[PDB]
Amino acid sequence: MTHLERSRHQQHPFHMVMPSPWPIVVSFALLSLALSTALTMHGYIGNMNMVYLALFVLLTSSILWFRDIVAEATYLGDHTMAVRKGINLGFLMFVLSEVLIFAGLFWAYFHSAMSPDVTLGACWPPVGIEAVQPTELPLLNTIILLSSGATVTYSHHALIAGNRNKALSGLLITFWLIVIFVTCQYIEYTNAAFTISDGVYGSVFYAGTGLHFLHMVMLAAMLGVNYWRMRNYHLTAGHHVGYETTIIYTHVLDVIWLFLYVVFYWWGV
């Protein structure tokens, strides 16, 4: 084509982002959250009202940031294939950083488990603490993640194919499947013989399973956002990077749950 209407464009595929006020606001909110939760843990302020509003302003600033990124990604239309591969590799490295936090928690469990202290009775699990048996409720909420992975992968491969009634049905039932997982996980927490303070076993057990618990409620929020922008026709057939992102996230969450489940419920009892 003409040079005159070729030099009226970006001249390189990469993103040039206009100056946006959502690093500074969410950093302000992160500072206020850190100081208020360092200040209310010692009885300096009266209630948890202020750490509540600090967590809430962090949540609503970050959801306004994600509003800005979905508007820029599908309305202004800048996410070409180079930027798509960039944000894909960035999410891969972020999740590689999350699984190392999980590896640090597993290091804590292994170090205090396979060399048990003389104050635990020199046996893992310790004396008196009735450990959770792995075959009742752990079996349901370890088969429900495999069923969730199967239905989210056929919803993905129906989104690439072209049918809407299947690619929406898979996403709806994987959302309700993992929220049923989260609710029965809370059911498992609210009747268990040990608390987070009862020894080191309850401490590292609840640390690992609670971090996975918070990770899948964040996954459920991500999948609710993805179902909303799948219903409102944002997701295309070949430009769904914000959905490939969350299916990569839920499959690696499934495999880190099975690692956590095996060595937290079978070997550790």
Binding site: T40, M41, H42, G43, M48, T119, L120, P126, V127, G128, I129, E136, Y186, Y189, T190, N191, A192, A193, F194, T195, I196, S197, D198, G199, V200
Partner: protein, 53 residues
């Protein structure tokens, strides 16, 4: 089975709950929310604080 077992250990008087060990129910500082001895999912049936008779 676990529900009927929790209904079995509902009506147990609290001094018949066994005196359990040093690592169980540690309290370095009191919890800043609640009365002082209450976690988030603290079931008042299965997780009693014995207060050492």
């Amino acid at each position: 089975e676990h529900a009927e077992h929790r209904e079995h250990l509902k009506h147990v008087p609290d001094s018949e709950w066994p005196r359990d060990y040093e690592f169980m129910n540690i309290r370095s500082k009191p919890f800043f929310w609640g009365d002082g001895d209450k976690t988030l999912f603290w079931n008042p049936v299965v997780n009693r604080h014995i207060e050492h008779d």
